[PDB]
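2024-03-11 09:14:02 INFO receiving multi-entity request
2024-03-11 09:14:02 INFO entity count = nine
2024-03-11 09:14:03 INFO echoing inputs for audit
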Amino acid sequence: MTDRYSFSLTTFSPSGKLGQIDYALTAVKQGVTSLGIKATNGVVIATEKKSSSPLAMSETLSKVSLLTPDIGAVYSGMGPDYRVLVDKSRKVAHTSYKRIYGEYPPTKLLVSEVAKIMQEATQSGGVRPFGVSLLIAGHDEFNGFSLYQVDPSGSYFPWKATAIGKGSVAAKTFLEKRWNDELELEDAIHIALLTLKESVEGEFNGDTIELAIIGDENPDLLGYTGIPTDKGPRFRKLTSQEINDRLEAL
Amino acid sequence: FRNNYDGDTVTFSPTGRLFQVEYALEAIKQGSVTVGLRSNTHAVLVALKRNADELSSYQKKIIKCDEHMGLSLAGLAPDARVLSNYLRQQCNYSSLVFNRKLAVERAGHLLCDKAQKNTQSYGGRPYGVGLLIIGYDKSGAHLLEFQPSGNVTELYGTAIGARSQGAKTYLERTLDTFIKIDGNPDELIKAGVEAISQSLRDESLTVDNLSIAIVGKDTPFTIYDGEAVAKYI
Amino acid sequence: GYDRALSIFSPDGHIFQVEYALEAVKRGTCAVGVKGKNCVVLGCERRSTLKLQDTRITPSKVSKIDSHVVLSFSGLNADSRILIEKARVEAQSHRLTLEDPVTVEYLTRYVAGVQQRYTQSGGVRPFGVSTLIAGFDPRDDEPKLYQTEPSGIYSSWSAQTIGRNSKTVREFLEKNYDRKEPPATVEECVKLTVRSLLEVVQTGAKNIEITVVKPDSDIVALSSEEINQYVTQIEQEKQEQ
Amino acid sequence: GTGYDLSNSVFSPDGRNFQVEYAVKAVENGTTSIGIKCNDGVVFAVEKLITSKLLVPQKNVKIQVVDRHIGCVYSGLIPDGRHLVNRGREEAASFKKLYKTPIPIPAFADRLGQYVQAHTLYNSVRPFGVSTIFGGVDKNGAHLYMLEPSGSYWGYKGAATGKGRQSAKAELEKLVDHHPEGLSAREAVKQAAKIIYLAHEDNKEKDFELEISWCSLSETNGLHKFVKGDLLQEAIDFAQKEIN
Amino acid sequence: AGYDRHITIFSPEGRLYQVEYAFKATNQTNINSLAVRGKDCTVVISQKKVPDKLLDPTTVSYIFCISRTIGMVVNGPIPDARNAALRAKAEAAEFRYKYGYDMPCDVLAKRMANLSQIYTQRAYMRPLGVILTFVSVDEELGPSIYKTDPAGYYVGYKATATGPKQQEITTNLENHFKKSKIDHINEESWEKVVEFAITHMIDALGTEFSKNDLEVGVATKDKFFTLSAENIEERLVAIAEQD
Amino acid sequence: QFNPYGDNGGTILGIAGEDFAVLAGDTRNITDYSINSRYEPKVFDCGDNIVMSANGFAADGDALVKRFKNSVKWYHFDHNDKKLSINSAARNIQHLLYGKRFFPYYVHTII
Amino acid sequence: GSRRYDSRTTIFSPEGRLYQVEYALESISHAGTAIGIMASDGIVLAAERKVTSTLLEQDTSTEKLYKLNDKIAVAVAGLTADAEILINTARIHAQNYLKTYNEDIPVEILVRRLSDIKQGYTQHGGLRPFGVSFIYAGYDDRYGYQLYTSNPSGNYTGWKAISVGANTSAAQTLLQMDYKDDMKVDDAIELALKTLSKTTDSSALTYDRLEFATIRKGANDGEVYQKIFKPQEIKDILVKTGIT
Amino acid sequence: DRGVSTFSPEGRLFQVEYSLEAIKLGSTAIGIATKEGVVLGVEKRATSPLLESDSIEKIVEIDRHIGCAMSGLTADARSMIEHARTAAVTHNLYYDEDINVESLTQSVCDLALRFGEGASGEERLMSRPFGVALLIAGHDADDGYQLFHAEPSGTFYRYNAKAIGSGSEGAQAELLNEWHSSLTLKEAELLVLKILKQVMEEKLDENNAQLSCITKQDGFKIYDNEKTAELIKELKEKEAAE
Amino acid sequence: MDIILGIRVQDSVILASSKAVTRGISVLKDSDDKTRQLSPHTLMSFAGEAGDTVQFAEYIQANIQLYSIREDYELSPQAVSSFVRQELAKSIRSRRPYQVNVLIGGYDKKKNKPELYQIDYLGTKVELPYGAHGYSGFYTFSLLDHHYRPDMTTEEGLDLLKLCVQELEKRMPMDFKGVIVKIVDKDGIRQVDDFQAQ
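2024-03-11 09:21:47 INFO inference complete, emitting structure
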């Protein structure tokens, strides 16, 4: 019934600060650590699966999501706000792009669409900003591999490597020492696992760690053969088994 | 205390009171006194009119709604215009669509329902007027009292406005007498003028001061002012 | 959607949002208009705070509403554009339905009506703008000068000023403008306009800008050198005492 | 930091909606009304305060009908109760329009429930200042319900609300134990008159008027019907007989 | 400096107090519920408290039949619980009509948790003070338990418990699944799975139950149903003979 | 295809003298070659000493009369029981008729 | 209702100022400085990135300098998210104008429109204003090279040289000191970098902290060309001026 | 804050009562009804001597038989007059007659309470009441010469004589004593001039005060400045005589 | 239909327009000016459906005049004719389309060149040395193909129109009551007072 909230809930304070955006960023700091690293032949996004109960099934809850065959997303902050953003980000990729051009949006443009949705949450009547920072990793033919961060304000930045959430300060330092412009993808996954260990207090294995890549095209993940131009998704979520292998020699 | 819970009608007080509705009730208590009373054949309204100066006219208190129904007002007149207009339309609808003279009881239920919607929704204020509705439908003479809370009571006699407690006590004592005044409209008006003067603490009732309305068995709703009311002074 | 009543009555009987819109006008740069026998002159001050402006492209305070009517303003610059546009649309609309350009009084009444409308509508604040509307009615050689304010009130003036230090310049015109015998020449009328702005603006050829409207759509803004010449003559009058 | 009771939809720190609790106070302030469920129907009764000799007897009817088989009675703000019934009347007509069959009582109860609950979800609406006792006879027997301002409702053997809810419930619970194999429609009507008189001790300074209605498979053909004349006098005399 | 606790906007700390205060509302009714998975069934148990002898016990229920396959147990006040029910029923029917197959348990949960997240972001809607537990035997995933809260959070479970005395039941179950190693009840028939759930509620809450103290809902292949007082009574005889 | 109009026959007459006027009409109502009614009044006293008749399609006639009668009623409510002069009634009827200029009343009307 | 939580974003102060516009301008005074200098043969746009990291990718980065048209470009000060919303409408506006008149939009017309949108959020709608200040650099066949500035109030002005964001007061005096009307573009490049270098809150002015652009007529082509300097190109021009 | 249309504990609407205080700050306006016609007079009150006084329009024609005088926030009156005129002309289109003065006033007052924030009942899109009171004077065949005072409360009184604005309390006391049933038009014109002269801060002349009347024969006329000057000259002589 | 003719010569655009207004069997007027001035250097003639014709012209005129006041600038004939096209292109797909055919005659002060544009009710624009709407074209197009040179003086251009008007008067069935002729050049728009017997 009658929505009487047609006015802004995020306004400027005498100091110039936008209260609700700042507080949203405070919620992101409390959130579990997630990171992203860009190698020469791929990108890796990683986070910890913080389970709410040992009776809960962590497989049913994905912190890493596929947005397009070539684009994936991870977050720090409020889970539910992320889930609904993922749904909208998947839809906008179709409505605002694929239905027009018959192909998937490049990483920068889908990021731009995601940011717009979050900027609206800053200015529209009767809403609060989203309480999440996103890391979006992806590939497109003309840009190659890219990695972006999207803040509650709707701002986005391109990163060689970065971390968000709890231990982001220490993790950004650890990445600065280890990142170079000549990293191969298997090297990048190695760093990703090492950086995430400093954050994780408890069990460190493929059941408590979520990890996905943007790499080579995967024809066996396509589901069909026949069209030569269709080569398969570059987004791949690593299995619990695949993570453990790199942890035995870590 | 009252500070916080009187901001709008939508808000309940800790004791269960709606202060905005109660303040609207206060406008009626400031309004000039009016009296209703009925027998089995006729129903009567007697109203005391108020002026601003001795250079001003006295504001009209009685409104006709249909040939068989009408009402008197105490409080905000613009609100009484809004409500009487509505009741006119409802009477109009009943005649055109069903070829049926709207029952006085149903008129009350409709006014009750219209007042209610103002008492529960944000933004809108309550109405600030009380009404005394007299009619003659298929089941004899009727008299109704309307309060802007929504409450509507069917009565033999009643009064609303300032000092109206005097007139109401008179009717409560004379109940057995005036109810038997059947087929003699004059002797029912005589009882109404005697009722209203029990609420006169200030002035004498004059020829341009007094207003009377009657409906009944063979009498369509008619208003009397000026030299018409002279014989009841 | 948004319909919150922003302009409302207060216990003492004032609309505070309208009262504060007047304060915005008092902050704006001074504007003055004087009418002669056969002309109207609008004078406006330019701010000196930043001396790096590009005058070619910077919006000027004197706007043409039609070919025969001009509008100057004091207050919030951004607000003035809204009022100007509406007035310019109504001007073309009036030529379309009536087959005749607007009278100065009509255009004033329309602008004043818009301003008033923004003082008793939900969800909107009053215009922080007062205007001077000047010109010549179609086929008429009698000069017209009008003023409007945020409340929506309007009236005609022989001479008027608005904005900062307008108390000072109004005081000047009250003891310098003769209604019996108005300024006879265009040159005589422009001199008085510059004289009044010299009371509130310190020596500035850059600072004072003048526009002269004559009968039958003859509007021309003055160059800096032309205005500078008026200043040069006026300042030599004082030293004679 | 307080002020949790100033706006409707707001949760207080302990998890409550204070504005609904304030509506409950308006109900407790009101006239007492009851419902008895019997072996083939339901009986409704209500107290009517006679403020003055001037109120015409039998004329200010409180108990209302939805459709032809449902009866409703309420304590608290009468206009609110009237508004709730206007909704119920629209709601039942809509149901009959689409499914042909008249609305089942459990179905109708939830229709009121969702509507009253809706008025606790927004700050732009006021909660309902009524408790509503209602029921009737459908495809599978009699049903009796009570609806609170929060939107909470349950099925009842006997229901009571308003001023004299304490006296009423105390007397209703004695009936459940004294009549374990059900009570007849005739009996319940007479017994309903007693409860109303006994709950009038709470408001004993004023004179009152009794109003009763019933819905029964065998006595009224499963339709809502008011109690009049000889049957009502019989119930009034029975209540007077058990007071001395 | 005050009003950030009345509507759903962030506090300086990054917290939504109205969501936190809605969680508090879920425990108002002082009722504990638990859900467990069998080999090919799913069972919900909820405490039935009828304190008033004027009530009709058959109408006192916090277990709802959402669709032919899906059932829902609610921890929270009934008007909010029934609100959530009516929506779930509507959403389940609309899904079947639009997509031609029955809405899965995990999908209905995600949907209801999305709606819960909206009230969490938009100011004119208050959160519902309820925790929803959905159960079924999905035609792809098998026996399922999914739980949604006023935060809009949802996850799958091996088993779960909800209410004031939740932790007793939670730890009790946790200890069993470390002992049994498998993540379900290794039993063929649902009747013996219902018995397990009642046994484990007794040992966790330290209280015996009668047929009127319990409420039971069972989900099997292509069917969800709630047990009558007598079905529970029969089930209560079985545990008395085992001890 | 549905035809919204029909023809009910009849005929009406109106003559005015010095201090009086008359309005007459047959009481027969017909459809095609059948007689619907032998006595169906078609001339009505509308109040304020105005007689009215609309002839042609009876359902449009009855509607018009009914709408004008209601117009008289509201005029009294709005203008302090002022008598509606015949010239005023005429202009008022013009607006009723022309208000349905694009779905006309198939009547010839006389007051 | 909601009256309790309304900031009233579009109201005057007793002084006659717009609260939100004022606070938005304060917000911008914290944003990285941007400078625009108009010369006789082109325009320069220089901007200072804020809070840079070594891991931040500059090649794919574009946060302060945006292309609106084939002939118009902007420098941004303030919320980047807010700016992109406006930048998109501006791009649409230029295209609408082109589709209507078959001519590129005159710079001032594009500026007036954006400035009109910003003014709207000031007078109606009860929403917060855009926390953005723009410098516009453009060219058309009427006024040639033009330089404009617009702030949250919707006010716009025309400049020969201007600065937005942090330290404008200090930046404007330095420009007023060194700017002359008959400036060559290569001289205007130096002035822009020198001014930034002096007003920087950082230790030194480096390539990874700068966005740089020019609008210049073809040194052989005869028509207008935009150039958004690449990191390596800025590193080159920063060694030239004498900052290294 | 507090709702716009909201009752006080005393039983009055805050906005309406505060609006009445704005009218008390307005310029004086006087109406006198006689059997030869109704007379309407206003104080111009120009804020500066540079103001062109005859551009102050506080007397307006509604129809040939109905005139209006305003007091208070006079910018608020424009849309009221526009409504009034349209009502009058519209009535003549439907009914081929002149609108009654009583019915015209009622139509103007119907607008007065149409303020709020998206309310129940009908549709009321206006943020505040009008900050202006009106004196409506005219003639019709039914009730003859009439003077109405229309308030932002939505209620209207008929007056034999009425003063509104800043000088209204002192003026109404004077009008109480002076008015009798058998006054001539010229006596009334001189009377309006006599009271305005008293309550004004400035000395009264043909520039800062305006006269108008409505008669059956010539309808509603606003007196030119040369005519009013002569009545001021005539009033000076009569006061000096006794 | 009405006669609507245009011809671009060396340094001017010449527009000739039919003077008659005929409805039914009566010639109601023989002195009708079937043109509007859009700006000091741009002139538009028009022909088509009875009402649409003047309403469209005056509507376009108000918009170009509004642009001039706002911008303190005059749109080039190319810009004006694109605005007109798009309004017609809009209107042809609306509920009731403007049935108006126009000619835009303008002198571009920036380019120092005369310009003529033919635009029909569908929104079909084209720039031409000479143009005609209606049946008129069936005679004048081939005549001008023969006689026209691109460097003709304004005096030569008027002679060339007289040759077109003589042909239309001889061969066309309708009495169009002669023409009103206007010149558009660098000095603005003027009317040739004597053409009827020049």
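2024-03-11 09:21:48 INFO post-check: The helical segments of chain E are 17-25, 78-99, 105-121, 166-179, 190-205, 229-242.
2024-03-11 09:21:48 INFO post-check: The radius of gyration of chain E is 18 Å.
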